[PDB]
């Protein structure tokens, strides 16, 4: 309706809005997307090869954890599919060994796969044979975060109102199950997301349907009370992201249709509220290359890119800090990931099976 018209305007202006737009329909939709950190740049080719961690979300068919390759200028193909029990709610690679991938399932167990220990072609028997099953939750969830300073320390958020932490660094070779090291119980509702700080090995944040942002210190013996509890939004908080250049700064996204900006030195007062989304926000992620650049996505089928440096600048298109609106998707966006090796390239995935790899025009970000 308005979707068809707004899509027509988008199509029309696409040649001026983008330096790259690649569109691919996956067999089944992916709920998750994350660029792997590796890139190969062949000497006798005009492209480089990047890889993505994806998943399936099926009805009445075998699900898989997926690694796909993407050719980017200086084609998209499925390289690996691993049998997965149920849809992949979220999949994230371990920074210290990106062959290790944790997944969230529609049941309580959190799974870990080392993809070098599985065939690239899945057995049609469909057995899910994860390297580890991580126990501690009672329900499925979404939030998942590996500690970049403590190898094998993984956080998980669950619809059971808890956050679990595992340390998988010293599991016996033939051990296949790991019990949670610590369970954090501060939230009073579904915990939607969790994320470690980039620098402080003991600091992580969580957000929940209780409308709160909580900041946790793993060195504390009290796992029921966070270091800070913040009334962050006027509705469910679905996501958070720490700024990788500015150690005190983070962002949260919410069902209240806003992204909030926070300073860890004064959490009692929101620094800023980014307003433009027309429905619930499910993902927020800072740019890996640019300190003032943040993106957000959700149910309004839009991915907004925000530039903090334009806050308060001197109309009807949106606020000055709204840099770009990506309107390529015509269904709810499930996840997205900034490419870590190619500035301004994003992969976003929507519920209608579409994956887009795109890059706004150079003249837009200067």
């Amino acid at each position: 309706r308005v979707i068809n018209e707004e899509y027509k305007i988008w199509k029309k202006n696409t040649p001026f809005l983008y330096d790259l737009v690649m569109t691919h329909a996956l067999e089944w939709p992916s709920l998750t997307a994350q660029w792997l950190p590796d890139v190969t740049r062949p000497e006798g080719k005009d492209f480089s090869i990047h890889r993505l961690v994806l998943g399936t979300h099926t009805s009445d068919e075998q699900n898989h954890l997926v690694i796909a390759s993407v050719q980017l200028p200086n084609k998209i193909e499925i390289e690996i599919k691993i049998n997965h029990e149920g849809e992949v709610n979220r999949a994230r690679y371990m920074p210290q060994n990106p062959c290790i991938i944790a997944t969230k399932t529609p049941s309580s167990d959190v799974l870990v796969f080392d993809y070098t220990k599985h065939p690239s072609k899945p057995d049609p028997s469909g057995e899910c044979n994860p390297d580890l099953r991580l126990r501690g939750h009672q329900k499925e969830g979404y939030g998942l975060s590996w500690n970049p300073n403590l190898s094998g320390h993984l956080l998980s958020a669950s619809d059971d109102h808890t956050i679990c932490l595992w340390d998988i660094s010293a599991v016996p070779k033939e051990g296949k199950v790991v019990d949670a090291k610590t369970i954090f119980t501060g939230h009073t509702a579904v915990v939607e997301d969790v994320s470690w700080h980039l620098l402080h090995e003991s600091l992580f944040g969580s957000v929940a349907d209780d409308q709160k942002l909580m900041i946790w210190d793993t060195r504390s013996n009290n796992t029921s009370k966070p270091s800070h509890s913040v009334d962050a939004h006027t509705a469910e908080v679905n996501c958070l992201s720490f700024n990788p250049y500015s150690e005190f700064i983070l962002a949260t996204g919410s069902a209240d249709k806003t992204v909030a900006l926070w300073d860890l030195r004064n959490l009692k007062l929101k620094l800023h509220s980014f307003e433009s989304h027309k429905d619930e926000i499910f993902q927020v992620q800072w740019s890996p290359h640019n300190e003032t650049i943040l993106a957000s996505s959700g149910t309004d089928r839009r991915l907004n890119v925000w530039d903090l440096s334009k806050i308060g600048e001197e109309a009807e298109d949106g606020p000055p800090e709204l840099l770009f609106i990506h309107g390529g998707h015509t269904a709810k966006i499930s996840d997205f990931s900034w490419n870590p090796n190619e500035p301004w390239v994003i992969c976003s995935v929507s519920e209608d099976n579409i994956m887009q790899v795109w890059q706004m025009a150079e003249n837009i970000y200067n």
């Binding site: 329909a25 996956l26 067999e27 089944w28 939709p29 709920l31 979300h57 099926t58 009805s59 068919e61 849809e87 979404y142 499910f282 709810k332 519920e351 099976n353």
Partner: peptide, 9 residues
Amino acid sequence: SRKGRPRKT
């Protein structure tokens, strides 16, 4: 809930 009903291409 959060997830929709998926369909194959």
